[PDB]
Amino acid sequence: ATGL
Amino acid sequence: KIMEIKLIKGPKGLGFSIAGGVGNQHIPGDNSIYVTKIIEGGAAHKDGKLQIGDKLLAVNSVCLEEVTHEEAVTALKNTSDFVYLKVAKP
């Protein structure tokens, strides 16, 4: 997962 | 069911995380980009349309189908305050  | 989401990035950014991508399958067989956390009162959340589990198809007609995690993240980080998402629902 990658926070944006 | 495909939908359009138009956002204004906030001080915490767009307010969501993604997974998946070519070489980082979130679901086996599926190279797609998936929304995996919507964050309390962020942009995405206030708007209310985007949902944990949504496939992202496009961001600003930059295409998110069959791309790598980091190609997707690049495209999502390379955004102004105005952000358009095209998503497919489950």
Radius of gyration, alpha carbons of chain B? 12
Residues 6+ positions from B89 with CB-CB distance below 8 Å: B1, B2, B3, B51, B54, B55
Q: Give the dihedral sign, CA B75/B33/B63/B49.
A: negative
Q: What is the resolution of this structure in A?
A: 2.3
CA–CA dist B84, B87 (Å, integer): 10
Yes or no, beta carbons of B14 and A2 under 8 Å apart = no
Structural domain including B20 reads 1-90
Name the method of structure determination. Answer: X-ray
Distance CA(B51)–CA(B67), nearest Å, equals 21
DSSP state of B40: T
Token couple for B76: 């999502």
> Residue B31 phi/psi, 5° resolution?
-80, 5
Q: How big is the CA angle at B73 (ends B18 and B21), to the nearest 5 degrees?
A: 60
- The residue among B12, B17, B18, B1 whose CA lies nearest residue B81 is B12
Distance CA B25, CA B41 (A): 28
Q: Distance between CA atoms of B62 and B45, rounded to whole angstroms?
A: 22
Domain at B36, CATH number: 2.30.42.10
For residue A3, the distance in angstroms to the closest alpha carbon of chain B comes to 4
If you measure CA to CA, which chain A residue comes closest to B38? Answer: A3
Question: Nearest 5 degrees, angle CA B11-CA B17-CA B19?
Answer: 155
Longest dimension (CA), chain B: 35
Point out the residue among B15, B39, B69 whose CB comes nearest to the CB of A2.
B69
Q: Assess contact for B8 and B43: CB atoms under 8 A.
A: yes
Q: How many domains does chain B have?
A: 1
